[PDB]
Amino acid sequence: LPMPLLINLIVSLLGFVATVTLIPAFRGHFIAARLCGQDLNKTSRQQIPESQGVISGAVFLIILFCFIPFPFLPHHEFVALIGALLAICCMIFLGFADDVLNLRWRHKLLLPTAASLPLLMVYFTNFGNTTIVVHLDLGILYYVYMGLLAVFCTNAINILAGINGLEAGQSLVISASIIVFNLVELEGDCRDDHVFSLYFMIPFFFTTLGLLYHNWYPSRVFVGDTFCYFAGMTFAGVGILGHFSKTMLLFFMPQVFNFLYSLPQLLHIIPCPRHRIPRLNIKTGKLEMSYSKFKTKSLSFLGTFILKVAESLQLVTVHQSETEDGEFTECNNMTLINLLLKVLGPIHERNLTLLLLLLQILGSAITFSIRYQ
Amino acid sequence: LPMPLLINLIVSLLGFVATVTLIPAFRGHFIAARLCGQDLNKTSRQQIPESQGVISGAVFLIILFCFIPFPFLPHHEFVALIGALLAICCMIFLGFADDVLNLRWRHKLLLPTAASLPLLMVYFTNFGNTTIVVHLDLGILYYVYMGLLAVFCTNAINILAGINGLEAGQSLVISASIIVFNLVELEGDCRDDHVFSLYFMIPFFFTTLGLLYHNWYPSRVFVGDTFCYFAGMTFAGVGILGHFSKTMLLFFMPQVFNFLYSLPQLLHIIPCPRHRIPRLNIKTGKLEMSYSKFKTKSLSFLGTFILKVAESLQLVTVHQSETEDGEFTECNNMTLINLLLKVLGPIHERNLTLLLLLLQILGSAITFSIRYQ
Ligand SMILES: CC(=O)N[C@H]1[C@@H](OP(=O)(O)OP(=O)(O)OC[C@H]2O[C@@H](n3ccc(=O)[nH]c3=O)[C@H](O)[C@@H]2O)O[C@H](CO)[C@@H](O)[C@@H]1O
Ligand SMILES: CC(=O)N[C@H]1[C@@H](OP(=O)(O)OP(=O)(O)OC[C@H]2O[C@@H](n3ccc(=O)[nH]c3=O)[C@H](O)[C@@H]2O)O[C@H](CO)[C@@H](O)[C@@H]1O
Ligand SMILES: [Mg+2]
Ligand SMILES: [Mg+2]
């Protein structure tokens, strides 16, 4: 039973060591390729290599390619293995192309949909359960759900970002929670689904651990959208093929809140700045809330209602002003990072990430409490 | 029998139209990403977008992802379908990473080996014939051959390059020749191997046709190593899984000659310039042979022997000189493009590519003559 899992653990540890070693080896290449960026929440104007998710993602693929023959050494699970790797690999690829080319916002939705196609087709060919428990047969709409799941998880991680070790950290907690959940369900019942998930979650964990080694505060490298795209698809892939997307989405609680809280800014009903990461008080050294200021006359009818409702619900900190240019509204940037800075006041970057990571652990523990009483 | 082939042809035509439309749409993004280069054989110093093989390659993948359920709508060929796409997709990815990052020469060998792993494992799991006809069982060495085949075809195309429409053009002739060969063998005998090859060769053809639309003289876009990597793996994949790598390698005759003729320069026994593309006589407008000048005292014992042998065989045009700096040897750059310019004299770029393409057609016709008497 654990014979291939042993081999998977062995190659995943080698993959950790590979990721830790290779990340600083390709440093030059990324900086030369202009694949870098400043640490926007630090005074240092130096450029730190970006898109390092491509190196962990690459290690992850090569690990699993070598692993492929072991579970076989029957095709119903083997199809799902090569199928899920196709989807993950295509996603690391289109994700990296997006990092290199900076495609229009439409592709943040089209690329995950594109890459998710092998998962859908494997589910189609291996005769997948289109019926859902609330007892409803969604049919074609179930495949729309599977497509959208990949789109969701990638962007949900990507919009809960911008502080040292958060993106890679939250994924690290999520994969660990999936691993723990798989091991519990490996004791009986649906087992071939959970031994399957472990085959991707063990290598995803140790490679991301190798990435976080160089990403954790102070960040020596940045993960890029390549990592957020990669993570999202790996999670959506194991959720779908393991048939536990419901349970997996509950492990996405901080990501789901942060998304809906961001919805008025994403939909531009309230002006949305390109970067909604907190400000650094250079005197304090700690992070402070970021704000989006705008002319109140330019704001839409629906936008004034949402902002008034969210302020009264003790969620958004709004600040009215009136200069020579006119009357302005300096409202709080709608994200979970800022809401923690609203409630708990200014927080140092290292503790802020670690706080959201703890909040992530809390949610996983709540899900495990829901599911096992 | 042709029901899925009809669907494959339909999506491949849509893929052509997609490639022609999208190539000029992402132009901005590539130039902005510094993914471009000058037309080194033209006076214009403007920068033309590079790595457009990524857009044809991307279209190729999405085409085939949509095609996946059709041959099914049994897993022995379905595994080989998802397996070959994994290898091709990983290769387009690592090929593009190489275009973006400019990795050391070692990776021009490591990336194709890395990406070829799913093919090997599919061949392993689906119980592939390790025995070869000269009757010898190569076993592990057969897998070494499969790995090296991908390495060969990618670089063999990549070193027979540097003139408008050559890289994409030679692949276009090769895929057409594989298509013709498949259709002949579709009449009987081994058929499931040739209907399989057609599934990748039809979409490879029409996407490359869309690429060559913007690449053909005068090049409006450049294909990049991404295309050479992509092409090589798609050809190695169909050759391996179709069991016709021998026949396929004979379609690689101009690529095999150009490789062995380049061997003294590649091995640096004779100095090798980074670009061995012909020179443009600005007065003539036509292309002229390129040369590699070096001090004869610095040349190795083996290098003097090779150069003397190759000169007497009427292959290399050597020119001795002696300035104030010392005695120099200005020998001809060892490539098939230059050998055609040695034998046929200066040739215009458009006719030179078209001449090598004709030479490619000639070789395919020779192979078809070998094989069918
Ligand atoms: C709609 C939405 O919510 N978009 C967010 C998303 O955009 P988005 O994903 O587009 O932004 P990027 O992936 O380009 O951001 C990466 C850049 O952010 C900065 N950075 C990133 C990580 C880190 O620990 N420290 C750091 O300073 C660096 O300049 C880095 O180069 O993520 C950004 C931070 O990643 C947030 O500003 C954006 O508001
Ligand atoms: C060992 C070997 O044989 N290496 C060759 C290989 O290197 P290599 O593959 O490394 O070179 P590249 O792929 O970077 O060359 C692409 C560049 O070549 C020029 N270019 C390319 C295509 C074209 O039609 N016109 C044009 O001018 C452009 O500057 C383009 O940007 O291919 C080059 C041309 O592709 C040749 O010079 C090199 O000698
Ligand atoms: Mg991002
Ligand atoms: Mg090249």
Numbering used by the authors:
A (entry chain A), B (entry chain A): 7 to 79, 91 to 151, 162 to 400
Kindly provide excerpts from the paper associated with this entry.
It catalyzes the transfer of an N-acetyl-D-glucosamine-1-phosphoryl unit (GlcNAc-1-P) from UDP-N-acetyl glucosamine (UDP-GlcNAc) onto dolichyl phosphate (Dol-P) (Heifetz and Elbein, 1977, Lehrman, 1991). The DPAGT1 structure (as reported here and by Yoo et al., 2018) consists of 10 transmembrane helices (TMH1 to 10), with both termini in the ER lumen. The active site is on the cytoplasmic face of the membrane, formed by the 4 cytoplasmic loops between the TMHs.
Complexes with UDP-GlcNAc and tunicamycin gave data to 3.1 Å and 3.4 Å resolution, respectively. The structure of the DPAGT1/UDP-GlcNAc complex reveals an overall stabilization of the active site, due to movements of CL1 and CL9, and the N terminus of TMH4, without any global changes in conformation. The C-terminal end of TMH9b and the following loop region (Phe286-Ile304) display the largest conformational change with an induced fit around the GlcNAc-PP. The uridyl moiety of UDP-GlcNAc lies in a narrow cleft at the back of the active site formed by CL5 and CL7. The uracil ring is sandwiched between Gly189 and Phe249 with additional recognition conferred by hydrogen bonds between the Leu46 backbone amide, the Asn191 sidechain to the uracil carbonyls and an extensive hydrogen bond network involving two waters links the uracil ring to five residues. The octahedral coordination of the Mg2+ ion is completed by the sidechains of conserved residues Asn185 and Asp252, and 2 water molecules. When bound to DPAGT1, UDP-GlcNAc adopts a bent-back conformation, with the donor sugar lying below the phosphates, rotated towards the uridine.
